[PDB]
Ligand binder design. Structure first.
Ligand SMILES: O[C@@H]1[C@@H](O)[C@H](O[C@@H]2CO[C@@H](O)[C@H](O)[C@H]2O)OC[C@H]1O
Ligand SMILES: *[C@@H]1O[C@H](CO)[C@@H](O)[C@H](O)[C@H]1NC(C)=O
Ligand SMILES: *[C@H]1O[C@H](CO)[C@@H](O)[C@H](O)[C@@H]1O
Ligand SMILES: *[C@H]1O[C@H](CO)[C@@H](O)[C@H](O)[C@@H]1O
Length: 381
């Protein structure tokens, strides 16, 4: 449908943010349907430059389910055509009583997440660290995912985590007795797991609502903007430091962290891969390590894709200070609940949330220095 998908752009060189609305081959997006093909191209580019290869669904995916009290266990086996298999068993915490006719809405929470989950939503606890370890650079190629695909598989730890989420949703589709509404699945995580949750929502289209919390550099911040922050004296995490600190990105990314303008994507395009589905991310200006200006500018740039698709209110961003890292401030519960209410609970909640305190330290956000495109009105359904 999309023709030959570009995964490498050898001649690319753009110090500003890559344009969401033009394909690698120079074709301008015109229809809402065009975004499907552009998202597939962005997927290939992100895999090639920074995330490694995301394997497709394997030939063997089996699931069994059992429940004790209000806790379900979803036992998953995944296997390749060469007979290799791995197994993992996430748990689900259920609300009590009769579920809705179509099952409970569900949030997949990376290691439990750090947001309050409303009482009518089930929580699946995903041990992403067991799927792909993330202690330090020493963790490269370690985890269940690599016991299936091999320790030298190019998938980053975050890409391995996505693969696991995709197997969980496969298992839920195959297991109606788990009583989950598979059309109302969200994902969340905080800090390094918030980087993971953004990757999951971007790459796994069956996720209705994505909630990254204080994800920082490699999450809802942009590489190019964080480079600008660190060059101007903000003590931010940036691409150069992050690839030496852990294994959240492919080893191939090391070849580009000093040459960011040659990368034909940034994390505004990563975030835009969630479109036309819903996402709200939350940031904290108390920690310059999280690169506050970069997140605001990056999500402002990503927002133009939802704007061009006529669904601006499906994308939210709320950035405040005054609380510890991954502590949830009660002041943002209304904004969080608005998105859960609308996109997981089918309520008529308004979701116009795009706010910052502009506390960016030694830099300012100047959209004209970073966003070079006008937002088109994409046509059609
Ligand atoms: O040690 C790292 C290498 O493993 C890495 O190799 C890259 C992996 O992805 C491939 O697509 C690239 O061709 C290849 O260069 O390069 C960087 C190095 O730090
Ligand atoms: C440009 O690339 C996109 C994505 O692969 C494709 O859909 C489109 O048809 C291409 N343009 C031409 C003129 O082939
Ligand atoms: C990235 O991926 C594309 C296909 O997804 C290839 O055509 C390209 O050569 C690179 O391997
Ligand atoms: C895109 O990626 C390829 C490797 O997949 C590079 O060889 C090329 O120069 C461009 O960076």
């Amino acid at each position: 449908a999309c023709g030959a998908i570009a995964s490498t752009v050898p001649n690319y060189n753009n110090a500003k943010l890559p344009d969401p609305f033009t394909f690698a081959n120079g074709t301008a997006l015109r229809t809402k349907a065009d975004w499907s093909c552009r998202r597939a191209e962005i997927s290939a580019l992100i895999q090639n430059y920074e995330a490694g290869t995301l394997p497709p669904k394997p030939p063997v995916v089996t699931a069994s389910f059992s429940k004790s009290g209000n806790t379900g266990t979803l036992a998953i086996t995944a296997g390749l055509s060469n007979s290799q298999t791995i197994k993992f068993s996430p748990t689900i915490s259920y609300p009590s009583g009769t579920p809705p006719a179509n099952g409970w809405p569900l949030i997949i929470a990376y290691e439990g997440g750090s947001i309050p989950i409303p009482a009518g939503v089930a929580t699946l606890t995903y041990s992403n660290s067991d799927m792909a370890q993330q202690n330090s650079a020493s963790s490269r190629g370690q985890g269940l995912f690599y016991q299936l695909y091999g320790s030298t598989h190019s998938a980053s730890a975050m890409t391995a985590w996505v693969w696991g989420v995709s197997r969980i949703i496969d298992a839920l589709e195959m297991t109606p007795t788990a009583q989950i509404n598979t059309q109302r699945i969200g994902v969340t995580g905080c800090s390094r797991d918030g980087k993971g949750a953004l990757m999951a929502g971007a790459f796994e289209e069956r996720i209705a609502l994505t909630i990254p919390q204080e994800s920082g550099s490699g999450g809802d911040a942009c590489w190019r903007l964080s480079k600008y922050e660190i060059d101007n004296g903000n003590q931010v995490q940036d691409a150069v430091e992050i690839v030496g600190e852990n294994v959240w990105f492919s080893t191939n990314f090391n070849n580009y962290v000093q040459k960011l303008p040659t990368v034909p994507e940034d994390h505004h395009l990563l975030a835009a891969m969630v479109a036309p589905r819903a996402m709200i991310s939350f940031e904290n200006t108390d920690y310059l390590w999280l690169s506050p200006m970069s997140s605001f500018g990056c999500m402002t740039a990503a927002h133009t894709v939802w704007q061009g698709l006529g669904i601006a209110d499906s994308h939210g961003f709320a950035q405040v200070g005054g609380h510890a890292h991954c502590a949830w401030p009660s002041s943002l519960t209304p904004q969080l609940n608005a998105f859960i209410n609308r996109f997981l609970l089918d309520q008529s909640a308004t979701t116009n949330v795009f706010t910052t305190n502009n506390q960016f330290g030694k830099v300012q956000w100047n959209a004209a220095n970073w966003i070079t495109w006008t937002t088109p009105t994409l046509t059609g359904l």
